[PDB]
Every structure is written in C-alpha cells, then in structure tokens.
Design a protein around this ligand. Structure first.
Ligand SMILES: C[S@@+](CC[C@H](N)C(=O)[O-])C[C@H]1O[C@@H](n2cnc3c(N)ncnc32)[C@H](O)[C@@H]1O
Ligand SMILES: C[S@@+](CC[C@H](N)C(=O)[O-])C[C@H]1O[C@@H](n2cnc3c(N)ncnc32)[C@H](O)[C@@H]1O
Ligand SMILES: COc1ccc(C[C@@H]2c3cc(O)c(OC)cc3CCN2C)cc1O
Ligand SMILES: COc1ccc(C[C@@H]2c3cc(O)c(OC)cc3CCN2C)cc1O
Ligand SMILES: [Cl-]
Ligand SMILES: [Cl-]
Lengths: 335, 335
C-alpha cells in the first residue's frame, strides 16, 4: 500500500476507527524504536546532537472551534482529575495548575505568549483583578475573539498584542511570562529564550509548558516512507517535540527553578474529548464550515484532518499508559 | 544477623569473595528500588526534591598507593579500550579523554581542582609544554608528591596550591578548570560552581567528571538497618552521587556546552584492577603500612577497608552491564 492508497481510503471514511488507531499506533511505535538507544552513553550522544542542531537553526470560524473544543477553546493539554471530568472542567483545572506553578499573584503584569483563544488570559484576568494580563498572538481572529470575550466578561485588565513573537520588539517587561504549548512551533529556541529574557526583570518568572517525549527529542515528520500520518497532520516541517529535559540545555539567558512533567493520559483525554465533541456536533460543524470553504468535499477534508489529529494524538499520548509522550513544565528566572 | 556479626566475619577474612560480592550487590539493588519511580512525573518530583535540598545545604604512604593503584596513582574511573588494557594504559587513555573533551590546547592556563596524586596535572604539563598547569589539593602529602614527580620529569610548568577549595580565595583566573571526581565531596554545590565561575573569564571552559547514577541522585549512606557497607566505606555523610543530569540544574553561574556519560564497566574494570594489584602485592602492602599504623591488626583493618571498597565498587558500577552507576561529564562556559 502506498501513501496515496491509504490517504484515499482515509478521506472517503473507508478506514474504521480501530484500523486507523492501529495504523497510527504503529507509526509512533517506530518513532520509539528510532529514539531509544541501548546505553545512556548513546542516549546522551543522540540527545546532545539534536540539541546542538537546534542551536544552528485561512482560519476556522469561532463557531466551529466552539463546537469541537471546550468552553474557553483551550488548544493545549488539559488536566483530568476524574474519569468523569468534563473538558470544561479540565480546561479550568489546567488553568489553575498553571497559575499555581507559575506563582501568579494579584497585581502582577502577565504576558501569555501564543495565547490562542485566550482561555488562560481570561482566567487570570478574572481571578486576579489587579493583574494586568497581555495576550500575544499572530492571529487577528484570535485577538478579536479575546477582546470580545473580555468585553462580555466585564474585564478591564486585558490587552492583546498582535505579533509574530519572533519579530516582536519591545522595551516592556513583565512580572510573569507564560508559554503554553507554543514552543513546539519555535524555529529558533536559543533566540526565543534570549528574547523572553529581555522582557523580564530580576523579579520576573517564566513558565513554559510543552509537549515532550520523556527520553528523546524529535521533529514531527515522517519516520519513513510508510508514514502517511506525520506530513498529513503537519504539512510543514514546523513542529519540534523536545525531550522532557531539552530546555535544561537552553539556560544561556534564564536559570531553572523547578521542573515537572504531566503524564500523557491527560493529553490523551483532552484530544479524546475534542474528538467526541466534534463527532457529536458533526452535522452542525459541516454546516458552519460550508460557507467559508465552498464545497462539501473541502469541508470533509478539514474535518478529516482535525479528527485524524485527535485520533493520532490519542495513540501518541496514551502510549504505555501516558509514559512516552507527555507534557513538560519548567519555571525559570532571568540570569 | 546484625551489623556487628557481618562486620566481625568481614574483618577476620571469614567472608569469601562470592558471598561478599553477593551481599554488596543486594545492598545496591535496594538503592535501585529506592530511586526508581513508577512514572516520569514521580521521577522528576523525586529528583527535584533532591536538587532543592542541595540548595539549602592519617594519610596512606605513597609506597602503599604505588602498590595498589596504577602508575600515576589515578584515583578516579579510568578508560579501558580492550579486555587486555592494563590499568597504566587505562589511566593514560582517561587523561587523553579529559584533554579532548575539555578542549585543552597548548599555551592555556589550567587548574585541576582536587588533583589527587596529580596524574592529570603531570599529563597535561608533559603534553602541552606552553601550558601552565596548577593542581589544587587539600593534602600536603599530595602536593609534595606532585612537586617531586614534576622535578623528576623535568617539568617546569607545574605548581600546586595547598587549599580547601571551599575556603580558597583568589583573584586569579584560568583558561581551563578541570574537576575530576571531586564534586561528590562538595557539601555546597551551588556555591562551588559559583566560586569556580569567579575563576573563569569569558574565554574559559570548565570540565566536570563525576560518579553518577543515570536516573536519580542519592547520598552515599545506609539504605536501611541491614546495610553495613555504606557507613563502613564512608563513615561520614560526606559523599553525594548526583544523577547524570543533576548538574544541569546548577547553571546559575555557568552554562552547559556539552554532556556525556561513560558506561560504568570502565569504572568497574578500574576498581577490579586496583583490587587485583593490591591482592598481588598484599605481603608488600602489609609491610609498608606496619610502621605508620603500629599493629598488624590496624594494617589488616586499613587493607580490609580498601579491598572492600573495590569489591563493592565492582558490584555498583558493573550493575546491569554498567547501565546504572556510571560516570557523567559536562563542559561549561561562564555566563
Ligand atoms: C498549540 S496553540 C496553544 C495556544 C494556547 N496557549 C492554549 O494553550 O490554548 C499554540 C499557539 O501559538 C501561536 N503561535 C505560533 N507561532 C507563533 C508566533 N510566531 N508568534 C505568535 N504566536 C504564535 C499559534 O497561533 C497558536 O495559537
Ligand atoms: C576521588 S579523588 C580524585 C582525585 C583526582 N582528581 C584523580 O582523578 O585521581 C578526589 C580528591 O578531592 C580532594 N578533595 C576533597 N575535598 C577537597 C577540598 N575541600 N579541597 C580540595 N581538595 C579536596 C581529595 O583530597 C581527593 O584527592
Ligand atoms: C487542528 O489544529 C490544531 C488544533 C489543536 C492543536 C493543539 C496542539 C497539539 C499538537 C499536537 O501534536 C498534539 O498531539 C496530540 C496535541 C495538541 C494539543 C495541544 N497543542 C499543543 C494544534 C493544531 O494544529
Ligand atoms: C580507599 O580510599 C579511596 C580510594 C579511591 C577513591 C576514589 C573515588 C571513588 C569513590 C567511589 O565510591 C567509587 O565507587 C566504586 C569509586 C571511586 C574511584 C574514583 N573516585 C571517585 C576514594 C577513596 O575513598
Ligand atoms: Cl509545545
Ligand atoms: Cl564525583
């Protein structure tokens, strides 16, 4: 079977969920074989090579997003206490976790880099009325959504910077900088962390949450010629999965204070909840998308892409009961 | 069996080698059970707790040393290419490895912290005639030995500082600072690395080699009431075994450039070679020690201690084909 063949059946809805899950699980299995080395000597050689290599380097309508994601349209791993925890509850729990670990206190200036649909920005703004909370996003649609929500929620302490963070120049500093699942998209990590440090003072803290593998780093890209999945999900080579410890080697400009990981079952439950909600609201979703996409085929294409992302993410993060791919968190101060 | 009972039989030479090895292997096995956590979440919690805790904190005659250790009396893990590599060859190979990884070049000023009997100091001084090489040791006997050897070898580029490194104050800086298996003895790591950084310029490099476990950190101390070994070897709580990654969290004042580990079989072969050489020269060793110790019983005691250290070290570093306890190496520059 060629890529073309599998892609054909997938797009026609000819692959059942069990086969789809099985196929993607196998692809991730091959990544594990690629990444695990026989000795720690070899593991560190592999990991440091990757780290050294790094140092050399249309939008969906909000109504569709509301029908697939949770209440605040969080697009990052959430935190599920119970088997019965809803996605809305898991969003709030994860916001709370970030506030704790980043040591948010009322009255601080807070910058959220790559703030998405602004769930965390709105959470902090509501909980800490004396905080001034700035979201930074490269999407005008996202900025517009956040500002409307802030207006609706009677929040007066929210602003949004519309910028490519890699290009953004400012003299402004913040007490707290948060980066929630944005760093995977950063082409230039060393320069990224350096830039963030220039937006900190001696009293600031930087909190980063990133998708990871516990042991090794990898680009999200085809493992071989049999891998139809990786390039389907990310048609660009624009996504890097750092190991859980990779950022420890990026302390030129910031210094680590604390380090955690969150088991991958939380991410797995997140993507599962999105997949189930999209499935439930499938008819509605196809209706919402049709105007802006132009044809039922183009609508089916976008839905297949998002649904497959969730199915694949489930297999990735649930692998070995969440003990392969997971979420890493780090707290830093400025040098 | 109480500690007293096992200690009694050990001191009388009543425990055969097989039983001795077995007993010590079991003690190390219990340490592994203590250190490995079921999830990476828990592993990082355990490791960060240890790291946070750190941030709150008679001499043997040279003739005896010559009869137990290799030619340069290296008292650190050596590097064995072949099954037939001698300890003398393994000493030289490890010196060479340090020179490569620390990027030693002719003409540099070089400081070796806790230089022991000065094998590395003498190696660098001989190989790089334009280097000025300083050893720092807290032992007058060690200083005296190094200076005599330098005289014998017609070396003019060696000096030795007699100091407790934790108390040593100087304005002098060095192009290269080497720390070979000394950091385990450092009570205050954060302050240690800070002090070293004040002896560096922007052009300096710092190379650290330390005994480690690949996964977790631990004090070298009794694992329970059945552990007669740990306190026998180190009657003080003065030895810490850092994980292979622990020093990544000590980058307040220095920044990592590279990171390696050396499989534990090299250390295992080192202690094995010492044990075999001591055994071969046993009669001679007892003769050498008798004057300064006063009784045959006191001589037997010192020999039992050193021999058991080697037997125990074998089981520790050879555990799981060298993939538990091993040697970590890191290269840093100043912030
Ligand atoms: C996976 S989403 C996480 C969003 C949000 N932090 C959350 O937790 O829901 C990553 C976000 O980074 C944003 N982003 C990616 N590259 C960016 C860049 N160069 N500048 C600014 N934002 C960027 C994307 O628009 C996206 O919303
Ligand atoms: C395990 S030996 C390694 C010696 C040598 N680097 C080698 O590789 O053979 C560690 C050395 O650190 C020295 N040392 C321990 N604490 C010290 C201190 N506070 N100041 C200076 N030297 C110290 C000891 O005297 C000992 O020689
Ligand atoms: C459909 O568009 C998208 C929707 C959501 C995301 C979120 C992104 C993401 C990326 C993954 O590879 C992943 O593995 C399971 C999980 C997640 C969830 C959180 N975050 C880090 C990216 C998209 O590109
Ligand atoms: C007998 O006195 C001693 C002789 C040599 C040492 C060397 C010390 C050491 C300590 C260990 O616990 C160990 O585990 C196997 C191995 C080694 C070899 C290298 N170095 C890091 C310490 C002593 O206290
Ligand atoms: Cl990320
Ligand atoms: Cl050490």
């Amino acid at each position: 079977e060629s890529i073309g063949e599998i892609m054909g059946k997938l797009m026609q809805g000819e692959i059942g969920d069990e086969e789809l899950s099985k196929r993607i699980k196998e692809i991730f299995g091959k990544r594990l074989q690629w990444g695990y080395k026989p000795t720690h000597q070899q593991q560190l050689a592999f990991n440091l090579d990757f780290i050294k290599s790094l140092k050399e380097m249309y939008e969906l309508p909000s109504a569709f997003l509301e029908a697939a994601f949770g209440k605040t349209i969080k697009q990052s791993g959430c935190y599920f206490k119970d088997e019965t925890t809803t996605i809305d509850e898991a969003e709030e729990a994860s916001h709370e976790l970030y506030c704790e670990r980043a040591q948010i206190k009322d009255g601080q200036t807070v910058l959220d880099i790559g703030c998405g649909q602004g769930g965390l920005v709105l959470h902090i703004a509501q909980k800490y009325k004396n905080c001034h909370v700035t979201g930074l996003t490269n999407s005008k649609a996202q900025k517009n959504y956040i500002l409307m929500q802030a207006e609706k929620l009677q929040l007066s302490n929210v602003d949004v910077i519309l910028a490519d963070v890699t290009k953004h120049e400012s003299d402004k500093t913040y007490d707290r900088i948060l980066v929630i699942e944005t760093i995977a998209h950063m082409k230039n990590i060393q320069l990224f962390m350096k830039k963030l440090s220039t937006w900190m003072t001696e009293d600031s803290l930087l909190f980063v949450d990133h998708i990871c593998h516990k042991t090794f780093s990898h680009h999200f890209e085809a493992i071989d010629e049999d891998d139809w999945y990786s390039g389907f999900i990310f048609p660009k080579g624009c996504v890097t999965i750092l190991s859980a410890s990779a950022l420890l080697y990026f302390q030129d400009d910031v210094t680590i204070l604390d380090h955690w990981v969150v088991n991958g079952m939380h991410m797995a439950r997140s993507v599962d909840a999105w997949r189930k909600k999209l499935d439930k609201n499938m008819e509605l979703a196809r209706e919402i998308l049709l105007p802006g996409l132009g044809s039922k085929e183009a609508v089916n294409g976008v839905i297949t892409h998002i649904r497959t992302f969730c199915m694949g993410g489930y297999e990735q993060f649930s692998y070995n009961n969440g003990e392969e791919w997971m979420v890493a968190q780090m707290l830093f101060k400025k040098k």
